[PDB]
Enzyme design. Structure first.
Site, PDB file in Angstrom:
ATOM      1  N   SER A 108       0.898  -1.205  -0.087  1.00  0.00           N
ATOM      2  CA  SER A 108       0.105  -0.215   0.048  1.00  0.00           C
ATOM      3  C   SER A 108       0.964   1.320   0.072  1.00  0.00           C
ATOM      4  CB  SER A 108      -0.861   0.010   1.085  1.00  0.00           C
ATOM      5  OG  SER A 108      -1.956  -1.151   1.039  1.00  0.00           O
TER       6      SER A 108
ATOM      7  N   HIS B 289      -6.953  -5.935  -1.371  1.00  0.00           N
ATOM      8  CA  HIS B 289      -5.999  -5.011  -0.977  1.00  0.00           C
ATOM      9  C   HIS B 289      -4.662  -5.519  -0.202  1.00  0.00           C
ATOM     10  CE1 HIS B 289      -4.525  -0.829  -0.482  1.00  0.00           C
ATOM     11  NE2 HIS B 289      -4.499  -0.968   0.747  1.00  0.00           N
TER      12      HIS B 289
ATOM     13  N   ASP C  60      -8.035  -2.757  -7.336  1.00  0.00           N
ATOM     14  CA  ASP C  60      -7.618  -2.501  -5.999  1.00  0.00           C
ATOM     15  C   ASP C  60      -8.858  -1.676  -5.247  1.00  0.00           C
ATOM     16  OD1 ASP C  60      -4.905  -2.423  -4.367  1.00  0.00           O
ATOM     17  OD2 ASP C  60      -6.023  -0.821  -3.758  1.00  0.00           O
TER      18      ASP C  60
HETATM   19  O1  LIG Z   1      -3.389   4.447  -1.658  1.00  0.00           O
HETATM   20  S1  LIG Z   1      -2.518   3.913  -0.621  1.00  0.00           S
HETATM   21  O2  LIG Z   1      -2.728   2.779   0.219  1.00  0.00           O
HETATM   22  C1  LIG Z   1      -0.971   3.913  -1.314  1.00  0.00           C
HETATM   23  C2  LIG Z   1      -0.418   5.304  -2.161  1.00  0.00           C
HETATM   24  N1  LIG Z   1      -0.475   6.470  -1.006  1.00  0.00           N
HETATM   25  C3  LIG Z   1      -0.361   7.523  -1.664  1.00  0.00           C
HETATM   26  C4  LIG Z   1      -1.006   7.626  -3.272  1.00  0.00           C
HETATM   27  C5  LIG Z   1      -2.249   8.090  -3.712  1.00  0.00           C
HETATM   28  C6  LIG Z   1      -2.469   7.986  -4.648  1.00  0.00           C
HETATM   29  C7  LIG Z   1      -1.359   7.502  -5.577  1.00  0.00           C
HETATM   30  O3  LIG Z   1      -0.387   7.278  -4.459  1.00  0.00           O
HETATM   31  C8  LIG Z   1      -1.903   6.644  -0.402  1.00  0.00           C
HETATM   32  C9  LIG Z   1      -2.222   5.251   0.522  1.00  0.00           C
END
Ligand SMILES: O=S1(=O)CCN(Cc2ccco2)CC1
Ligand SMILES: *[C@@H]1O[C@H](CO)[C@@H](O)[C@H](O)[C@H]1NC(C)=O
Length: 354
Positions: A145, A300, A253
């Site tokens: 994530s 996820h 996702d």
């Molecule tokens: O979505 S997440 O689990 C992993 C990515 N990060 C920043 C992000 C948002 C969109 C692209 O990058 C937030 C938490």
């Protein structure tokens, strides 16, 4: 069980100024090192960081961390649970900087919080070199994530750090799980006025300024001042990277659907077309990624889940694909490295998580 070590350099801190750290289980008969980055969204102003400190404090502070952690999935030391790297040296780096591992800013009388994610990774690597990492042949920087995006942002900086410290023989590689997102149009949308309504691109743009966030240099030079937010998106930053990176990404996702304002809770035609187009777009961005694993499931994260061995694409499991990647870095007959589903709807792959 992995054992907690708080960083000896106490100026490298979690959000609230407490020391950051890492959990470690050494394997003396092994020259392989796995460093895993925890995930857990982020915060991007005073207001929503204050909220996160009330009810998500372990992601902002080390004061309540336990002394040990059990390794699971790719961090497990039992071959029954981890066919890939069960004999490796194992490190779990807790996420306590709320900055998608990009920050380089200390708590000060100007700054209520510290955002030091990029510096935490560098300091962990430095202190591990005194505990056996100096003898490594492979350093695999992995994460899920927000930690998966953190791999993309930091893997080339770890490689440069080890080169400049005099260890050119350590091969640095990356494994990014559930960190490959699209800056696509949302199914329903709103203007950015608050946390609930701010689309990913606008929230990341504010976060980078709040955190003093850092992106890889070649990507930064392409998009230039004010546009560093582009480098948080996998299909834009990946072509700029030099270290080998394996990309694990569910095609549907759950975090991607959340930022797109999609809730699966009888699907009519507009939403059906939206979901099928999202899968097609994600598949397109991976078409030229030679090391990838992308099943057609709604889920996820996966790599530190104990049942991570269950899912298969074209008959090949994720632990097998990673082993084939290892062999390719020494095509291989019957041992593939690029595995992307082609069927167009969630759970059209029968091995998807229930
Ligand atoms: O979505 S997440 O689990 C992993 C990515 N990060 C920043 C992000 C948002 C969109 C692209 O990058 C937030 C938490
Ligand atoms: C501790 O970390 C900070 C931030 O990276 C760095 O500026 C400082 O030099 C470090 N201290 C030592 C003794 O290495």
């Amino acid at each position: 069980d992995l054992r907690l070590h708080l960083l000896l350099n106490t100026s490298v801190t979690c959000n609230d100024g407490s020391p950051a750290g890492y959990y470690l289980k050494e394997s003396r008969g092994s020259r392989r090192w796995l460093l895993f980055l925890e995930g857990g969204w982020y915060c991007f102003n005073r207001e929503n960081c204050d909220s996160r400190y009330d009810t998500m404090r372990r992601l902002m502070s080390s004061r309540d961390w336990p002394r040990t952690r059990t390794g699971t999935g790719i961090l497990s030391s039992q071959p029954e649970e981890n066919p890939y790297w069960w004999n490796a040296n194992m490190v779990f780096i807790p996420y306590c900087s709320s900055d998608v591992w990009s920050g380089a800013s200390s708590k000060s009388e100007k700054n209520e919080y510290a955002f030091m994610g990029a510096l935490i990774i560098q300091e962990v690597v430095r202190e591990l070199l005194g505990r056996g990492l100096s003898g490594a042949k492979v350093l695999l920087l992995a994460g899920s994530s927000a930690g998966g995006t953190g791999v993309l942002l930091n893997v080339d900086r770890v490689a440069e750090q080890l080169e400049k410290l005099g260890y050119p023989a350590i091969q640095v590689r990356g494994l990014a799980d559930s960190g490959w997102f699209l800056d696509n149009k949302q199914y329903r949308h709103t203007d950015c006025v608050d946390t609930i309504t701010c689309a990913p691109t606008e929230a990341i743009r504010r976060g980078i300024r709040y955190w003093n966030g850092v992106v890889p240099e070649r990507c930064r030079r392409q998009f230039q001042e004010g546009e560093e937010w582009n480098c948080f998106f996998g299909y834009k930053v990946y072509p700029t990277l030099r270290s080998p990176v394996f990309v694990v990404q569910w095609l549907f996702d759950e975090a991607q659907l959340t930022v797109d304002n999609v809730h699966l809770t009888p699907v009519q035609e507009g939403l059906r077309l939206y979901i099928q187009n999202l899968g097609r777009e994600l598949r397109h961005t991976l078409k030229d990624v030679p090391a990838s694993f992308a099943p057609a499931c709604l889920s996820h994260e996966i790599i530190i889940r104990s049942h991570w061995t269950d899912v298969q694409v074209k008959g090949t499991s994720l632990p097998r694909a990673l082993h084939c990647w290892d062999r390719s870095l020494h095509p291989l007959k019957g041992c593939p490295v690029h595995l992307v589903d082609s069927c167009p709807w969630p759970h059209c792959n029968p091995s998807c998580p229930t």
